Design a protein around this ligand. Structure first.
Ligand code: LKS
Ligand code: NAG
Ligand code: ZN
Length: 1014
């Protein structure tokens, strides 16, 4: 196993180092506005060394953006694919590449058998080639690597089954900035090459000058280079035709033959394309070949890639003709004019890469090695695309909730083979596809029009319902005596109870467990733990009485705590934000203990008075001018007081001190230690009154954030033996700090309401001497070192915070983990900040044509971990990566993959069992079974189950942590007959395993295994 901490990789280009060096001046470079006037030596190419040019036709089809997926499919995409089939069928030499499988699959299933066969034929023969092959071309900033793999697998599994092909080349021309998580997953999925386009204009300029636009992209911690994937970065401002034939768009635009007038398009540089004829072909070729040779100077081989396409292109047959015919005339002339020393033709993306590597093997070029990422992107001047790291935060949070439910549903149902009737495969496929669709770079990014965001949301809602159905049928089967099990596949044996989604204050959707001497004395609840280690976690349920006690199924008492059900109300009358307690519903809380990848059943029973093992929390409302807060049968009266500082300590954990406004001010780790200053503060960013305006994509602040005026907010303090919390009703946010004995959980109920042109940021102020360094994660997969650069505007120092960020000095670290991707930064030494929501009245000129005014209440969740790191073995100062501690990592898992909760629906559960999975191995803490998925339907004689295993890397800080068992996923199901290591999509077997044992993986590695069962 490679050491991912102690050996700083040696690479030709390290992006953090490059950023430290670059000056980022935005000067007018001439026709290539962001470059320079490229010059070349005419004699470079000759009879014995020609420039091979591949023109690659393509059509960018957004699975939703300005229209919904189905609207674009009906108005554009089905015609584009229908005409592509006809045109490629009839013109053997024409080529075309396709990226979005969601659309292709929608199209193909609608084709008649005759057409499906013609389609398979132009794919089989090389004319139509799939690039990447994912359900979509995903966002790379907000997406979790697990969902990037999910969508890739969804498109590629469809391609293998119906087109009998698996792309090995990736095409990512539109995500706003690029992540090394992509080559990470692709290289482990059989890929050999990839292409990216949206990187900072200064980076393009810099790498172009060094001919470093093509590179072997390895992971920041990879000393050996085995994770390397060949990458081609496009050099210009756009992938449209004007910015793909060469440096001068005024000239390239003349070679987009769709812009002559009848299609309603034209060249903004004021020179239109002209039909190619025998009289102008030599002059037109002179111009085109000169652009081609200029572009060729930016790369190292004599093989040139010329993409030919734009959004939803190649729709009309007349379009196919006008582009194909004119280019064929150009090629016939150019290829027969020896003096150009050029051989040009239509080609696919794989063709370009194969030729490039043949040049490389001929000793024609050596390529530089590179590590780092390509965030934050700016397409021009100070227009940095850091706004979309936060846009439509409700759906960014929904993404993570669905991410988990998909995993839990696939895992819970994978244990058994199911009758087709049960519609398990059916519900799982819909759930994977709706979550996969949302990975699109206009889905999770929050950059779609309002009615499209609504479409993604309704699709995810149906996916959530599908997961619940599969999960609850699975639990009923796993915990019912087999000879008693009698399933009705349409019936709801259990209801899922989710405490954080939509969240209290967002939607009253949780059911109350109604108990009573005259109706029902008790109720069974069951917890699922998708993680492969034993886990304890507090769980809560709403109950109709405070007099409830918990027992496990052996009837052992379980200590519990009852607290009121508090809801906050913006009182339109008194003009204050204050809480009201329920007099009919109460929260019962207790610690559940659950086997690795297993289930644990508990029973809640009512009594007519206080149960021996249930305690009741005290509640204290701090505000001036209080009114009574009756709590029905709740046994402890609410206390009142004037606002004042408060301190709280649950169990042995930290002691937290809060200001009189209910905000954290210090954290004391142990009884003796100092009260470390850690202050939460909420501020607001505005929008510029003159100049470029912030929108769904761009963050263009009118300077540093300004403190929000808090007034004297109402603060609610609840103190219990198992859980305590402090909640304050701020304007736009009900901020809650919850304590259970470890690092606190922070929840923000964010309702930016009608505050126009405002971005609300949550900031942490500490005295940690972090200087200009901070760390953020990439796709929930790895943490990369960031360096605040004062030479760049504030918005450029904002980065995606898909799951966590931290700052540290020699002794102390503060880590903030998230349950949703948001944008954030560390704008001053000792600080961390993360945007909560943004509401913008203006469009930011990137084509969306609207501002962001569809905000809705969202419940953001976090874990805040303060730790001493002076004893931790950390990477050297020159290493570009950072790593979590065991506590920070478990905290992230508590947010992303919590215990699932199920409430039995009927009065009596006959045949109920107390636990499932007690014999599953409890793996080492840094290992996770990211995916468990049965890959065969019940009619398959040989059943197959796929597993994706990921091992993260945690810092060694002196905690002995031992006694765990080896996890061999191939033996989790009985009767194993074979075990294979496969690509991460499960589509190709890479290794037949001895003894049918799946070895565990190395730190930061991810492997897939498929076990076969007789
Ligand atoms: N990039 C194009 C092609 C193009 C459009 C206009 C001018 C030049 C080239 N289109 C992008 S632009 C848009 C962000 O601005 C993005 O969210 C959307 O998914 C799309 O496909
Ligand atoms: C696709 O599968 C393999 C891959 O090459 C080969 O038999 C041939 O190309 C195709 N045959 C089919 C339809 O399986
Ligand atoms: Zn796009």
């Amino acid at each position: 196993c490679q050491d991912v901490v102690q050996d700083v990789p040696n690479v030709d280009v390290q992006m953090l180092e490059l950023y430290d060096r670059m000056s980022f001046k935005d000067i007018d470079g001439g026709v290539w506005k962001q470059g320079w006037n490229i010059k070349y030596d005419p004699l470079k190419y000759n009879a014995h060394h020609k420039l091979k040019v591949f023109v690659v036709p393509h059509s960018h089809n957004d699975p939703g953006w300005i229209q919904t997926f189905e609207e674009y499919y009906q108005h554009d995409t089905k015609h584009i694919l229908s005409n592509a089939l006809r045109h490629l069928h009839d013109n053997p030499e024409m080529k075309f590449i396709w990226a979005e499988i969601s659309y292709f699959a929608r199209f193909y299933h609608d084709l008649g058998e005759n057409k499906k066969l013609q389609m398979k034929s132009i794919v089989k023969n090389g004319q139509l080639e799939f690039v990447t092959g994912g359900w979509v071309m995903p966002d790379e900033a907000n997406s979790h690597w697990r969902n990037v793999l999910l969508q890739l697998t969804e498109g590629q599994t469809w391609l293998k089954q119906f087109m009998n092909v698996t792309p090995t080349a990736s095409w990512a021309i539109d995500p706003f900035g690029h992540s090394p998580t992509m080559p990470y997953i692709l290289q482990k999925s059989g890929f050999k090459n990839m292409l990216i386009q949206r990187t900072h204009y200064s980076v393009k300029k810099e790498l172009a000058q060094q001919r470093q636009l093509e590179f072997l992209w390895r992971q920041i911690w990879d000393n050996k280079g085995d994770t390397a994937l060949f990458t081609h970065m496009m050099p210009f401002y756009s992938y449209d035709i004007p910015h793909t034939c060469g440096p001068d768009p005024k000239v390239c635009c003349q070679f987009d033959f769709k812009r002559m007038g009848s299609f309603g398009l034209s060249c903004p540089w004021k020179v239109p394309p002209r039909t190619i004829s025998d009289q102008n072909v030599a002059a037109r070729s002179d111009l085109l070949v000169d652009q081609w040779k200029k572009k060729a100077e930016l790369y190292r081989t004599n093989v040139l890639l010329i993409p030919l396409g734009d959004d939803f292109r190649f729709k009309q047959n007349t379009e196919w003709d006008v582009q194909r015919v004119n280019y064929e005339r150009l090629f016939e002339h150019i290829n027969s004019q020896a003096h150009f020393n050029v051989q040009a033709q239509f080609g696919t993306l794989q063709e370009y890469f194969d030729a490039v590597h043949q040049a490389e093997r001929a000793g024609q070029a050596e390529f530089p090695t590179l590590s780092g990422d390509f965030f934050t992107y700016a397409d021009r001047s100070d227009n940095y695309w850091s706004g979309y790291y936060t846009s439509r935060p409700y759906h960014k949070r929904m993404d993570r909730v669905l991410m988990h439910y998909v995993r839990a549903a696939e895992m819970l149902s994978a244990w058994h083979s199911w009758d087709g009737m049960a519609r398990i495969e059916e519900r799982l496929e819909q759930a994977r596809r709706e979550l996969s669709l949302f990975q699109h770079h206009d889905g999770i990014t929050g950059t779609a029009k309002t009615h499209v965001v609504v479409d993604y949301e309704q699709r995810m809602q149906e996916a959530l319902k599908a997961c619940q159905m599969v999960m609850q049928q699975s639990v009923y089967r796993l915990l019912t005596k087999p000879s008693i099990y009698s399933p009705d596949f349409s019936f709801s044996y259990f209801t899922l109870d989710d405490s954080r989604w939509p969240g209290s204050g967002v939607e009253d959707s949780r059911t109350t467990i109604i108990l009573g001497e005259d109706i029902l004395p008790s109720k069974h609840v069951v917890m699922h733990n998708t993680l492969p280690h034993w886990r304890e976690q507090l769980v809560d349920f709403y109950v109709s009485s405070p007099f409830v006690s918990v027992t496990d199924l052996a009837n052992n008492p379980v200590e519990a705590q009852v607290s009121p059900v508090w809801s906050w109300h913006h009182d339109t009358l008194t003009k204050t934000i204050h809480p009201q307690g329920s007099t009919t519903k109460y929260r019962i809380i207790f610690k559940a203990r659950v086997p690795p990848m297993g289930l644990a059943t508990y029973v809640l029973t009512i009594s007519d008075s206080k149960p021996e093992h249930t305690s009741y929390a005290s509640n204290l409302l701090l505000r001036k001018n209080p009114t009574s807060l009756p709590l029905g049968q709740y046994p402890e009266d609410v206390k009142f007081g004037d606002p004042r500082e408060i301190s709280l300590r649950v169990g042995n954990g930290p002691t937290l001190a809060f200001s009189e406004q209910g905000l954290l001010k210090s954290i004391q780790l142990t009884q003796d230690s100092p009260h470390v200053p850690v202050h939460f503060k909420f501020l607001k960013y505005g929008v510029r009154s003159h100049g470029d305006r912030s929108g769904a994509y761009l963050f263009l602040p009118n300077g540093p954030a300004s403190p929000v005026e808090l007034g004297q907010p109402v603060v609610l303090v609840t103190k219990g033996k198992l859980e305590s919390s402090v909640s304050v009703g701020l304007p736009s946010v009900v901020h809650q700090t919850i304590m259970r004995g470890g690092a606190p959980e922070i929840r923000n109920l964010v309702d930016i309401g009608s505050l126009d042109n405002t971005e609300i940021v949550m900031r942490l102020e500490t005295h940690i001497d972090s200087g200009d360094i901070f760390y953020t994660d990439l796709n929930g997969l790895q943490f990369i070192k960031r360096r605040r650069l004062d030479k760049l505007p504030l918005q450029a120092n904002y980065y995606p915070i898909p799951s966590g960020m931290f700052i540290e000095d020699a002794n102390t670290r503060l880590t903030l983990l998230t349950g949703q991707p948001l944008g954030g930064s560390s704008l001053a030494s000792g600080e961390l900040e993360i945007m909560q929501d943004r509401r913008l009245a203006s469009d930011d000129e990137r084509g969306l044509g609207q501002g962001v005014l569809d905000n809705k209440p969202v419940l953001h969740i976090y874990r805040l971990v303060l730790e001493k790191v002076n004893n931790c073995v950390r990477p050297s100062k020159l290493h570009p990566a950072g790593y979590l501690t065991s506590a920070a990592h478990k905290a992230s898992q508590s947010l992303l993959d919590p215990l699932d909760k199920f409430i039995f629906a009927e009065n009596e559960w006959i045949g109920a069992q107390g636990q499932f999975g007690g014999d599953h191995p409890s793996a080492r803490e840094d290992l996770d079974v990211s995916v468990m998925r049965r890959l065969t339907k019940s009619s398959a004689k040989t059943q197959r189950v796929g597993y994706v295993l990921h091992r993260t890397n945690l810092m060694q800080c002196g905690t002995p942590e031992e006694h765990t068992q080896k996890l061999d996923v191939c033996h989790l199901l009985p009767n194993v007959a074979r075990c294979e290591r496969t690509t991460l999509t499960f589509l190709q077997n890479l290794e037949h395993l001895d003894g049918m044992v799946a070895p565990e993986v190395c730190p930061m590695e991810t492997a897939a295994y498929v076990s076969s069962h007789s």
